[PDB]
Amino acid sequence: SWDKDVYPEPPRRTPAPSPQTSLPNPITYLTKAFDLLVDRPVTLVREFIERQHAKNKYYYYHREFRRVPDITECHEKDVLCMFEAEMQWKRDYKVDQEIVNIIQERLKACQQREGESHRQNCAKELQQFTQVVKAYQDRYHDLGAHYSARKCLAKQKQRMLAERKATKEAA
């Protein structure tokens, strides 16, 4: 399963079709035949397989980590500090890429659910998409292929120093 609050779904809206005239309705007979020829046997097969699964019990756990301190607390060379620092940063980088993947899947799903009126009830998700992706464009973008962690902190210092000069001019 999945949380309904990270992959959100609006509530369902489904009409009840009122037939004006009486031919009637080939697809209703065909979907009842579909139910009787497909829906029952696959349900019986899945129920058998689920009983065979629930005879025994496996479990897999989620791997979790700790917070090794910083790269801002590591010294000149000290390779057994920078190692834990940059692996912690690289795992943050992977999980942040997947944050961007989740938001972009939400944008795709808002496109396909809301139909031929795109701009109704997709303003909020496009807003948060441009927000998180503006953060990504600011934070990880223009460093290249040989990122380790140190070019990211150099970009951090250079950007906040440039904005410090900008707000000094704005003072």
| Nearest-approach distance from CB 49 to other proteins, in angstroms | 19
Rounded-to-integer distance, Cα 162 and Cα 2, Å: 43
| Nearest-approach distance from CB 56 to other proteins, in angstroms | 21
Token duo for residue 4: 């309904």
Touching other proteins, residues 82-141 (CB under 8 A) = 82-83, 86-87, 89-92, 94-104, 107-108, 110-112, 115, 118, 122, 126, 128, 130-139, 141
State yes or no: residue 43 binds other proteins (CB under 8 A): no
Cβ nearer to other proteins, comparing 45 with 97: 97
State yes or no: residue 62 binds other proteins (CB under 8 A): yes
Residue 24: is the preceding peptide bond cis (ω within 30°)?
A: yes
State yes or no: residue 77 binds other proteins (CB under 8 A): yes
Rounded-to-integer distance, Cα 127 and Cα 132, Å: 9
| Nearest-approach distance from CB 79 to other proteins, in angstroms | 6
- What would the x/- binding string for other proteins be over residues 3 to 32, using CB under 8 A? x-xx----------x--------xx--xx-
Q: How far is CA 136 from CA 14, 24, 89, 99, in A?
A: 39, 56, 15, 10
Residues 86 and 71: beta-carbon distance below 8 Å:
yes
| Nearest-approach distance from CB 161 to other proteins, in angstroms | 6
Enumerate long-range contacts of 61-65, CB under 8 Å, 24 or more apart: 65/91
